[PDB]
Amino acid sequence: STGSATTTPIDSLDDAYITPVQIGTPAQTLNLDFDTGSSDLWVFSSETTASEVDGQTIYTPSKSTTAKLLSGATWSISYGDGSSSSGDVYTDTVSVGGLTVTGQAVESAKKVSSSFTEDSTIDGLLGLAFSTLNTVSPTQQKTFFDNAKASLDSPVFTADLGYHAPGTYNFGFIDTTAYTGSITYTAVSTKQGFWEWTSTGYAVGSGTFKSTSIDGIADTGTTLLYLPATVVSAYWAQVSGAKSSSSVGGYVFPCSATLPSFTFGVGSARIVIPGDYIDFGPISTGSSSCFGGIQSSAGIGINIFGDVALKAAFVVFNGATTPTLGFASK
Ligand SMILES: CNCc1ccc(O)cc1
Ligand SMILES: CNCc1ccc(O)cc1
């Protein structure tokens, strides 16, 4: 089997991408954020505290003839931005882009934090990291991909995120029309539960490539590119007037600037992020200070190849017995 679904930016900045997911019988379609940096499929639901729901579409398990409470199971997760959610668990039928999994753990939120309530475009998350990170207790649950894997034509999924435009998540096949050149594959460590890999270096604009190993994670659930402070300083030094602002929380730059590209290495291959992908717009409405899309990871503990980087590539998440990542230009 295969599946193929379009993923759409939630706003004009590409802050996150939501992809439609069919849950239950009859189907209830919710817009979930496919997250390769986490491993829980959770949804706003009829169980979510009413004051914490503001415009999201909810899953109502009592209206699904295939829903079953997973007795005793609870979940609770926290994200890098300080947001969180928690609740109980049902199993139900879940379909993405025509690919159906029966008995998928659907984590129903009883509580979500303020930044979930404040965004009505995200109806919950569909984790695509390794199932070792799933938070369900006392019996850890498998991700949608892990449950689908055995049925797929090939044990892979691909992320083809758009710049200010829709893109595609495919399951079970590699669309050879969706990229240019060849796909370069690189080793993955699953020891932390992430799609963790090592970039071979970087370049700023038309500058020379710096060969240096940069360990990080491929994370569709993170908006920006978070890299070591040395790398980030070298990038922003090429933008007149750019500076790190403690009050804003990162590098800002004059909105009048034209940003240089940023290249990262995948083995001997190179992925070029155009400068315009690094512009996240005014820090507040009407400001002439703009927020940068490349930021320091120093306060995180891990480097993160988020959407800024991934949207410049066609990315293969190869879930074979020894997982690998593939990157192609497009
Ligand atoms: C904006 N804070 C809630 C949130 C939204 C999306 C996501 O991938 C993680 C956290
Ligand atoms: C992970 N942060 C990206 C993001 C997604 C949703 C949102 O309301 C704000 C920010």
Swiss-Prot record:
Q: Where is the active site?
A: 35, 199
For the Peptidase A1 domain, which residue ranges apply?
17-328
One GO biological-process annotation of the entry reads: proteolysis
* Keyword ATP-binding in record: no
Disulfide cysteine pairs (residue numbers): 255-290
User: Which keywords does this Swiss-Prot/TrEMBL entry list?
Assistant: Aspartyl protease, Disulfide bond, Hydrolase, Protease, Signal, Zymogen
- An annotated Gene Ontology molecular function: aspartic-type endopeptidase activity
Top-level EC class: hydrolase
Q: What EC number(s) has UniProt assigned to this enzyme?
A: 3.4.23.22
Superkingdom, according to UniProt?
Eukaryota
Q: Which reaction does it catalyse?
A: Hydrolysis of proteins with specificity similar to that of pepsin A, prefers hydrophobic residues at P1 and P1', but does not cleave 14-Ala-|-Leu-15 in the B chain of insulin or Z-Glu-Tyr. Clots milk
Family (UniProt): Belongs to the peptidase A1 family.
Its name, as the record gives it, is Endothiapepsin
| Organism this protein belongs to | Cryphonectria parasitica (Chestnut blight fungus)
- UniProt lists the gene as EAPA
Q: Which residues of the full protein are shown?
A: 90 to 419 of 419
